Design an enzyme around this catalytic site. Structure first.
Site, PDB file in Angstrom:
ATOM      1  N   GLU A 162       0.838  -1.179   0.000  1.00 15.30           N
ATOM      2  CA  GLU A 162       0.000   0.000   0.000  1.00 15.30           C
ATOM      3  C   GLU A 162       0.877   1.234   0.000  1.00 15.30           C
ATOM      4  O   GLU A 162       1.740   1.379   0.875  1.00 15.30           O
ATOM      5  CB  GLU A 162      -0.819  -0.084   1.276  1.00 15.30           C
ATOM      6  N   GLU A 221      -9.146   9.722   5.683  1.00 16.95           N
ATOM      7  CA  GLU A 221      -9.248   8.865   6.909  1.00 16.95           C
ATOM      8  C   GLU A 221      -9.649   9.760   8.075  1.00 16.95           C
ATOM      9  O   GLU A 221      -8.764  10.486   8.540  1.00 16.95           O
ATOM     10  CB  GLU A 221      -7.951   8.116   7.211  1.00 16.95           C
TER      11      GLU A 221
HETATM   12  O1  LIG Z   1     -14.646  -1.866   1.162  1.00 15.85           O
HETATM   13  C1  LIG Z   1     -15.156  -3.239   1.428  1.00 15.85           C
HETATM   14  C2  LIG Z   1     -14.105  -4.034   2.223  1.00 15.85           C
HETATM   15  O2  LIG Z   1     -13.513  -3.155   3.215  1.00 15.85           O
HETATM   16  C3  LIG Z   1     -12.456  -3.784   3.883  1.00 15.85           C
HETATM   17  O3  LIG Z   1     -11.845  -2.837   4.706  1.00 15.85           O
HETATM   18  C4  LIG Z   1     -10.608  -2.311   4.211  1.00 15.85           C
HETATM   19  C5  LIG Z   1     -10.857  -1.026   3.433  1.00 15.85           C
HETATM   20  O4  LIG Z   1     -11.628  -1.287   2.262  1.00 15.85           O
HETATM   21  C6  LIG Z   1      -9.571  -0.406   2.997  1.00 15.85           C
HETATM   22  O5  LIG Z   1      -9.817   0.842   2.410  1.00 15.85           O
HETATM   23  C7  LIG Z   1      -8.680  -0.212   4.243  1.00 15.85           C
HETATM   24  O6  LIG Z   1      -7.379   0.294   3.962  1.00 15.85           O
HETATM   25  C8  LIG Z   1      -6.645   0.896   5.040  1.00 15.85           C
HETATM   26  C9  LIG Z   1      -5.297   0.191   5.108  1.00 15.85           C
HETATM   27  O7  LIG Z   1      -5.467  -1.158   5.572  1.00 15.85           O
HETATM   28  C10 LIG Z   1      -4.391   0.894   6.090  1.00 15.85           C
HETATM   29  F1  LIG Z   1      -3.105   0.296   6.029  1.00 15.85           F
HETATM   30  C11 LIG Z   1      -4.262   2.347   5.713  1.00 15.85           C
HETATM   31  O8  LIG Z   1      -3.524   3.104   6.691  1.00 15.85           O
HETATM   32  O9  LIG Z   1      -5.575   2.903   5.662  1.00 15.85           O
HETATM   33  C12 LIG Z   1      -6.419   2.344   4.623  1.00 15.85           C
HETATM   34  C13 LIG Z   1      -7.682   3.174   4.528  1.00 15.85           C
HETATM   35  O10 LIG Z   1      -8.234   3.338   5.850  1.00 15.85           O
HETATM   36  O11 LIG Z   1      -8.508  -1.459   4.892  1.00 15.85           O
HETATM   37  C14 LIG Z   1      -9.744  -1.967   5.406  1.00 15.85           C
HETATM   38  C15 LIG Z   1      -9.494  -3.119   6.341  1.00 15.85           C
HETATM   39  O12 LIG Z   1      -8.692  -4.100   5.851  1.00 15.85           O
HETATM   40  C16 LIG Z   1     -13.045  -4.892   4.687  1.00 15.85           C
HETATM   41  O13 LIG Z   1     -11.999  -5.549   5.433  1.00 15.85           O
HETATM   42  C17 LIG Z   1     -13.701  -5.904   3.789  1.00 15.85           C
HETATM   43  O14 LIG Z   1     -14.319  -6.967   4.576  1.00 15.85           O
HETATM   44  C18 LIG Z   1     -14.749  -5.235   2.933  1.00 15.85           C
HETATM   45  O15 LIG Z   1     -15.153  -6.214   1.949  1.00 15.85           O
END
Ligand SMILES: OC[C@H]1O[C@@H](O[C@H]2[C@H](O)[C@@H](O)[C@H](O[C@H]3[C@H](O)[C@@H](F)[C@H](O)O[C@@H]3CO)O[C@@H]2CO)[C@H](O)[C@@H](O)[C@@H]1O
Length: 222
Positions: A120, A203
């Protein structure tokens, strides 16, 4: 305009990008109102502790995110086939609240359309309140003619390389590949990995109503 209040609700704009509420870190209501070129956060209740995950990542994207692929996207695409990946954004900030405004750019060794991508890239255009990226600072980098404080770490799922602006950037046009190249150069991807999405949003940890993506574009040229 289209209002989305379901935690994982989405809609498509301009027949090209997906707007996602993406309320992945909060049990309190959040709504986004999609426009033809972006979205505004119209409700963002609750707080999240500022040393932990944010409440959400309401955002607009090109590409594939957890099976949701924007209309007609050419992503995932192998990086060594990409000539340029221009993107632009215009942000509306709020005074106060606790949030970042950031891009999320996802890379993987596979042509990944679902699940967690291995790397990421997070580009912080603005930071308000006592929050910081995942991991540790490393130093500065010059990317796209701008200086960034680089942070590196892991969230337990994936690698995270963050580029943090020295002060608020309310609008910019840039090449996503410039950040991908810097990431490859630090060993967190390879030239034969795939770009799977380009996302931009916020965020929020505290409040967030009033934040807006006024406009967004992303193309990946091969
Ligand atoms: O959108 C549906 C899915 O959402 C999943 O949660 C994700 C989310 O989509 C991502 O945007 C998010 O990214 C984080 C990243 O993990 C961090 F490292 C970074 O600092 O910030 C970004 C944005 O906040 O991650 C989450 C969680 O993994 C969800 O888990 C799924 O079940 C769902 O289908």
């Amino acid at each position: 305009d289209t209002t989305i209040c379901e935690p994982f609700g989405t809609t498509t704009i301009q027949g090209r990008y997906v707007v996602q509420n993406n309320r992945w870190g909060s049990t309190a209501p959040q709504c986004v109102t999609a426009t033809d070129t972006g979205f505004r956060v119209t409700q963002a209740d609750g707080s999240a502790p500022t040393n932990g995950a944010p409440k959400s990542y309401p955002s607009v994207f090109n590409g594939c995110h957890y099976t949701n692929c924007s209309p007609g996207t050419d992503l995932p695409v192998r990086l060594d086939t990409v000539s340029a990946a221009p993107s632009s954004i215009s942000y509306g900030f709020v005074d106060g609240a606790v949030y970042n405004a950031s891009y999320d750019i996802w890379l993987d060794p596979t042509a990944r359309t679902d699940g967690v991508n291995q790397t990421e890239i997070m580009i912080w255009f603005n930071r308000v309140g006592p929050i910081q990226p995942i991991g540790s600072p490393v130093g500065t980098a010059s990317v796209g003619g701008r200086t960034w404080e680089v942070w590196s770490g892991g969230n337990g799922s994936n690698d995270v390389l963050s580029f943090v602006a020295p002060s608020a950037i309310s609008g910019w046009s840039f090449d996503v590949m410039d950040f991908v190249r810097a990431t490859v150069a630090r060993g967190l991807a390879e030239n034969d990995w795939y770009l799977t999405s380009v996302q931009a949003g916020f965020e929020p940890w505290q409040n967030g109503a009033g934040l807006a993506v006024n406009s967004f574009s992303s193309t990946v040229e091969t």
